[PDB]
């Protein structure tokens, strides 16, 4: 599962979390089996203005 988010919201990408990303965008199950991999992409995904 692949997506872009701001650096603060990475802490919502875990089982049993709450807040606008966990609530309204991408919810993990309480007994998720898997791995969460994340990296800063400011060089690719940001733009001026």
């Amino acid at each position: 599962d692949s997506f872009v988010i701001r650096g603060d919201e990475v802490r919502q990408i875990a089982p049993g979390q709450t807040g606008n990303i966990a609530d309204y965008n991408y919810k993990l199950p309480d007994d998720f089996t898997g791995c969460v991999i994340a990296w800063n992409s400011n060089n690719l995904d940001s733009k001026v203005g």
Binding site: D8, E9, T18, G19, N20
Partner: protein, 50 residues
């Protein structure tokens, strides 16, 4: 205040929404002890001291 002589504000006689606090990701830490931060809107307290 300076941490040697901290403020203590009595919080009382009110309705309070804690969801507006803990969802403000500007807080660099939001630990809770004896309660879940998400569950606070389902509770009442005799007083709160900030």
């Amino acid at each position: 205040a300076s941490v040697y002589a901290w403020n203590r504000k009595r919080i009382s006689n009110c309705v309070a929404d804690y969801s507006v606090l803990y969802n403000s990701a500007s807080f660099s830490t939001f630990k809770c002890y004896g309660v879940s931060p998400t569950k606070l809107n389902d509770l009442c307290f005799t007083n709160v001291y900030a």
